[PDB]
């Protein structure tokens, strides 16, 4: 909280949008995805190896150029408008993002780099990086994580090369948008782009997991693609989403200067994939420096199948914290940052279990249940009490809540 933020050597003026915390600052520049022998680095390398070999083996295949060191500070234009995300879209809320100010932010997804890289005239590339979101707290959510983006453009003659009379076929037309295609795409083009997209991803998952994995495609919606899909993997009895993808919105591609191309794009969550691939039970593990964890990933070669031996699970301490929200001033994600900041990685989860309005006061009451559990050891009742009482006091000062208990 101030009037000027300093980040990665650059300075940004503060405004009504600014909400970066010091704690997030301690993580910007860490780049686990570039840290040799880190699990996220390992996935990245294996994905790179797949695309390299594909390029070397098949004539048809593009060279995917890799960008894994792009600054995470981007403009709201890069993060949102270049991707056709409407001005009133929920993903833009202050409570969901880390804004430096109205115009600059920590990127919420690697898709923030699609337009610029297209605009540079690239036909095929990967973007790998840390991304940032303000979200709830549990074993599957962290304010920082890592995505890998892929983008692949086709020209008409390239897409239809393997068809006999292929030069009478076209990429574009002027029809209507349906659940199956955009208004300026032909169904001929879309069918082939979709097939290529899904075949590519299916081969990549095979490369990563072997042929035993059960996967399914789910139809979905993104502003920057259409048609759009999520890929789910069945894991521990449950269908889990691992990536989004689809056919790039032609307006996005045209505006970047590739008016003669149709393309696909996908974004994959590295932590998710890594937790499934190595059976890592808690996302906080990526951030610990415990060798019992890290030593396991020091492989001779990136293809050496690592057999992650899960650490013991330590007991938790559970504490409730109740208070009265301020008179017309409060976001649930605000309290969660205060938790991240005081409780750090001692906190496994926070659940809002009760809320109600007191008639006389008119004030709203929140009750949160906080699960304290250390990834590396047993927490004492003593140390938790102190962490807990510190968060209690803080919430009073900084969030203008009323100690209810």
Question: Domains in the chain, please, with CATH?
Answer: 1-307 (3.30.930.10), 308-404 (3.30.70.380)
What is the three-class DSSP state of 109? coil
**Residue 393: Cβ-neighbour burial (10 angstroms; 0-12, 13-18, 19+):** exposed
Q: SS3 letters for 8-70?
A: CCEEEECCCCCCCCHHHHCCCCCCHHHCCCCHHHHHHHHHHHHHHHHHHHCCCCCCCEEECCC
What is the three-class DSSP state of 210? coil
β-pairing verdict for 124-132 and 104-106: unpaired
Query: Residue 332 is encoded by which pair of tokens?
Result: 């649930």
Place of tokens 């699990």: 39
User: Is 140 annotated as a binding-site member?
Assistant: yes
Query: Residue 240 is encoded by which pair of tokens?
Result: 């889990």
List the one residue out of 257, 63, 220 whose CA is nearest residue 150.
63
Separation of alpha carbons 64 and 92, rounded Å? 30
Separation of alpha carbons 395 and 334, rounded Å? 10
Separation of alpha carbons 126 and 118, rounded Å? 11
User: Is 133 annotated as a binding-site member?
Assistant: yes
User: Is 17 annotated as a binding-site member?
Assistant: no
Q: Is the peptide bond before 148 cis (omega within 30 degrees of 0)?
A: no
Q: Starting at the edge strand that comes first in sequence, how are the strands of the sheet with 317-324 ordered? A: 347-357, 364-372, 317-324, 402-403
Q: What's the residue count for the chain?
A: 405
**CA angle in degrees (0–180, nearest 5) for 18-371-310:** 105
**Is the C-alpha dihedral spanning 185, 187, 189, 195 positive or negative?**
positive
104 contacts 76 by C-beta, under 8 angstroms: yes
What is the three-class DSSP state of 368? strand
List the one residue out of 195, 196, 166 whose CA is nearest residue 54.
196
What is the three-class DSSP state of 78? helix
Query: Residue 74 is encoded by which pair of tokens?
Result: 């981007």
CA distances (Å), origin 38, targets 129, 148, 276, 297: 14, 15, 16, 7
β-pairing verdict for 65-67 and 124-132: parallel
| Other CB atoms within 10 A of residue 24 CB | 19
126 contacts 161 by C-beta, under 8 angstroms: no
* Residue 348: DSSP 8-state: E
143 contacts 133 by C-beta, under 8 angstroms: yes
Place of tokens 């006389």: 360
CA-based radius of gyration for the chain:
23
User: Is 142 annotated as a binding-site member?
Assistant: yes
Read out DSSP for 353-368? EEEEE-TTT--EEEEE
User: Is 386 annotated as a binding-site member?
Assistant: no
150 contacts 137 by C-beta, under 8 angstroms: no
Query: Residue 326 is encoded by which pair of tokens?
Result: 């301020």
Separation of alpha carbons 38 and 296, rounded Å? 9
User: Is 241 annotated as a binding-site member?
Assistant: yes
Task: Provide the experimental method for this PDB entry.
Answer: X-ray
Separation of alpha carbons 256 and 250, rounded Å? 10
Query: Residue 146 is encoded by which pair of tokens?
Result: 């890592």
Give strand ranges (E) for 122-169. Answer: 124-132, 144-154
User: Is 296 annotated as a binding-site member?
Assistant: no
Alpha helices in 210-313 (DSSP H): 250-255, 270-278, 291-294
User: Is 358 annotated as a binding-site member?
Assistant: no
Separation of alpha carbons 277 and 206, rounded Å? 12
User: Is 49 annotated as a binding-site member?
Assistant: no
51 contacts 111 by C-beta, under 8 angstroms: no
- Phi, psi (5° rounding) for residue 135? -145, 175
The helix (run of H) or strand (run of E) holding residue 215 is: strand 215-222
List the one residue out of 176, 175, 206, 171 whose CA is nearest residue 192.
171
- Phi, psi (5° rounding) for residue 62? -75, 155
**CA angle in degrees (0–180, nearest 5) for 216-282-305:** 65
Separation of alpha carbons 100 and 106, rounded Å? 7
**CA angle in degrees (0–180, nearest 5) for 90-104-23:** 85
Query: Residue 217 is encoded by which pair of tokens?
Result: 């495609």
Query: Residue 393 is encoded by which pair of tokens?
Result: 């006091």
Query: Residue 111 is encoded by which pair of tokens?
Result: 């898709």
- Phi, psi (5° rounding) for residue 11? -120, 135
**Residue 324: Cβ-neighbour burial (10 angstroms; 0-12, 13-18, 19+):** middle
User: Is 266 annotated as a binding-site member?
Assistant: yes
List the one residue out of 263, 262, 270 whose CA is nearest residue 245.
263
């Amino acid at each position: 909280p101030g009037s000027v933020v300093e980040l990665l050597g650059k300075s940004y003026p503060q405004d009504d949008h600014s909400n970066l915390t010091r704690k997030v600052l301690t993580r910007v520049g860490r780049n686990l995805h570039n840290q040799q022998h880190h699990p996220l680095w390992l996935i990245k390398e294996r994905v790179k190896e797949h695309f390299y070999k594909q390029y070397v083996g098949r004539f048809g295949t593009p060279l995917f150029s890799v960008y894994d060191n792009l600054s995470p500070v981007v403009t709201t234009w890069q993060n949102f408008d270049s991707l056709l995300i409407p001005a009133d879209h929920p993903s833009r809320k202050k409570g969901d993002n880390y804004y430096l100010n109205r115009t600059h932010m920590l990127r919420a997804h690697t898709s923030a780099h699609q337009w610029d890289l297209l605009h540079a005239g690239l036909d095929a590339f990967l973007v790998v990086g840390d991304v940032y979101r303000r979200d709830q707290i549990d074993s599957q959510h962290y304010p920082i994580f890592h995505q890998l983006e892929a983008v692949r453009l086709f020209s008409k003659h390239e897409l239809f090369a393997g068809i006999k009379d292929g030069e009478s076929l076209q990429l574009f037309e002027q029809s209507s948008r349906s659940a199956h295609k955009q208004e300026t795409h032909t169904m001929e083009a879309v069918k082939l782009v979709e097939f290529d997209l899904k075949q590519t991803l299916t081969r990549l998952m095979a490369h990563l997991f072997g042929d035993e994995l059960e996967i399914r495609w789910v139809d979905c919606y993104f502003p920057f693609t259409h048609p759009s899909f999520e890929m789910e993997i069945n894991f521990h009895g449950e269908w889990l989403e691992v990536l989004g993808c689809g056919v790039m919105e032609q307006q996005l591609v045209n505006s970047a200067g590739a008016q003669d191309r149709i393309g696909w794009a996908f974004g994959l969550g590295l932590e998710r994939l890594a937790m499934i691939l190595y059976d890592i039970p808690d996302i906080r593990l990526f951030w610990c420096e415990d060798e019992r964890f890290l030593k396991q990933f020091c492989v001779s070669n990136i293809n050496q199948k690592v057999k992650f031996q899960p650490l013991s699970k330590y007991p938790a301490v559970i504490n409730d914290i109740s208070f009265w929200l301020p008179s017309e001033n409060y976001a649930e994600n605000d309290f969660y940052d205060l938790v991240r900041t005081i409780g750090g990685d001692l906190v496994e989860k926070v659940d809002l279990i009760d809320k109600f309005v007191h008639p006389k006061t008119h004030k709203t009451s929140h009750c949160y249940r906080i699960t304290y559990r250390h990834m590396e050891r047993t927490l004492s009742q003593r140390e938790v009490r102190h962490i807990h009482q510190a968060l209690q006091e803080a919430a009073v000062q900084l969030l203008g809540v009323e100690g209810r208990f």
